[PDB]
Amino acid sequence: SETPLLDELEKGPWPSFVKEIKKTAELMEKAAAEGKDVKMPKGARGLLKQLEISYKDKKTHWKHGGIVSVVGYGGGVIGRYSDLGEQIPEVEHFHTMRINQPSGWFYSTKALRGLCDVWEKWGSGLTNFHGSTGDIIFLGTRSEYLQPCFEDLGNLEIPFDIGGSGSDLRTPSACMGPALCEFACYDTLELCYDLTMTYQDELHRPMWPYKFKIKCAGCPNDCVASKARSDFAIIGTWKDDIKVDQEAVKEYASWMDIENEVVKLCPTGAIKWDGKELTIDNRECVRCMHCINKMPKALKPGDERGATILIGGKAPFVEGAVIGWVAVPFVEVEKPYDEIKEILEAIWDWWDEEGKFRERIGELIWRKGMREFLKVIGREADVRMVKAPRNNPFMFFEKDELKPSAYTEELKKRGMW
Template sequence: MVSKTPLLDELKKGPWPGFVQEYEKMAAKKEIARRMLNQLELSYRDKRTYWKHGGAVTVKGYGGGVIGRYSAIPEVGPPAGCHTFRVAQPAAWFYKTDALRTVCDVWEKYGSGLMNLHGSTGDIILLGAPSEVLQQCFDELSSKGFDLGGSGSDIRSLSCCMGPALCEWACFDTLDVYHTLTMEFQDWIHRPAFPYKFKIKISGCPNDCVAALARADFAIIGTWKDEIQIDQEAVREYAKAGMDIKAITERCPTKCMSWDGKELKINNEDCTRCMYCINKMPKALRPGKERGATILLGGKATILQSAMLGWVIVPFMKIEKPYTELIDLIKRIVTWWDENARTRERVAELIYRVGMRVFLKAVGLPPVPQMVFRPRNNPYYFWSPEELEEVK
């Protein structure tokens, strides 16, 4: 029987389905799920968490992928060891139904049956496995073609948007880049060896549907280098149908657009590729033909130095097989970060501490105007010894 949960019952009110009903379905079948439900009710009642995070919990050959979870109240909650699996997801979360059923069957056999698709990292999150079944559960998942994702101080599981599979704005093949980088960095994903976590997220266009700008230490966001493609006749059709073209041009953040009632003009040198006009008039405007990606570094949530958005380090890079330039850049950045960061210091926090100038020199990137974070506020320039030697 499911224990009484008056506070959780409040969340079942209203027209929308919720997680409590799903919890109760598994609690009727699985004792561990029932105990997890009890603990959650107590957390709501006492306004505190009863989960203790941490501990070395792994399966053979892996350092990441299993997250240690321990209950502070195992006498009424779940067993002291009630751990979480992260199962690596396919590119852009494309699944066949039988694949999902396979994961569900394995998880109901060994764990609580409760799962989360998808966590902020992107993996399938399997919630609640006793310590004694971790290896058997992983072995069965592995035998059916599934692998663990990243957790701990490693390269976390990558994620990408649907890209050219379903989106006409994709500026490169996000799915192939995702797969290639995942295969390239398997060891760094599965075996934590770094000061802290490092996330790579891939968006095919500036709409940034995976929020790489805000959530990725290394963000790859599709863009174009040449002019926006304009179909003037389609623009006039939009205007004829009642669309206020002038209002769209006035909302352009750089005011690089103008409309005289017959022709739409764009000063592409001032365009920031925000996608606003393209999203409003998809039949008339398209990204340019010379496509690639902007590389940004340092997006993250609050830890040491508050939340940060990605910082442009490469304004434009061609993204073409075998992606040698991209892979080499990631390796240089991760190696420098690994050698210089303090414990639990993300790459953005390291750059904030030592300065962008030090970072650029270390990884061999040339400074460009797009990197400017804010105008300089002091008139002095300090020459490095190498620069002074070049002047001589």
């Protein structure tokens, strides 16, 4: 065998990525042998060979990449080079193209066959469905193929644009929401598409101190992991009462241990069941979703719908990993989403002016303070922004909050204050 280590991973019940690579290699080589226009027939086999050596060595064989892009864009293509250049020349250049997904990864066969045809012609035949951010990954191509691949994507009957990379607005993503989910508090897919479209320039042409990510979740269940994986997490919610179908609850009560599986599990004890009537103190409810999750036929999100915005979510780098925290307790999500757009724009202006090289929004807020951040987005401080008031008396006071005094005059006179 040419690949004894990777062959081990063709064994076992779970579908094999090695099989995916080999299948690509065989059929790309066959396609080129039949005279089909395929520029990179050996790309997938080259990848396999490199990966086998990497399994033998227990290390990567990719080096720091030179910076590359398609004409007019500064992002969406990642340069990647193999330190096994001479030995495996077919993967010396092996770049990734990030392709913007439809909202909620919904496809038709026609849309997908288009992508398959372009990538077969110009790339390795290897893809990721999907990249962690949400993009379709075109895994492995040369520099001179990037532009004509892009031209073809744009000319498809169902055309696909490049996603984001570098210091830009990344490709937004969204949960299925109102497509399949009865929990939906807003149209996630529509919001996602609208933002992607409104801020095409921000996405294609990186201009910021670092990357910025937006993700849209239909309800608190947070099915796109927005609060950990996006800088700006838009999570559906409501303001009024949970709707309760009483007869439906009774149907559940005949078989479900509602006391133990629902009542006792509510973080705030807002939900009660006596055998006849279900009761919810919506003043005490924190919209955690559990009770609704438990009884979808009986329980529903209220009518006054919108989103809570969580700011700061990120991976560790520099200052520590972040689950986003409350920036805006409630905002309406209605086309054309002017309220959400005003927030974003204000944040970007400020971040571009004040941010350091490679400083994420979360780190900027930590450095500049919540006060500055709130006045930037033009919002008031709210107790719902904290799990608890500060545990120390070390407060900043603004000049205008101080009583006039001989001392304040002294500060004024010195030129400080």
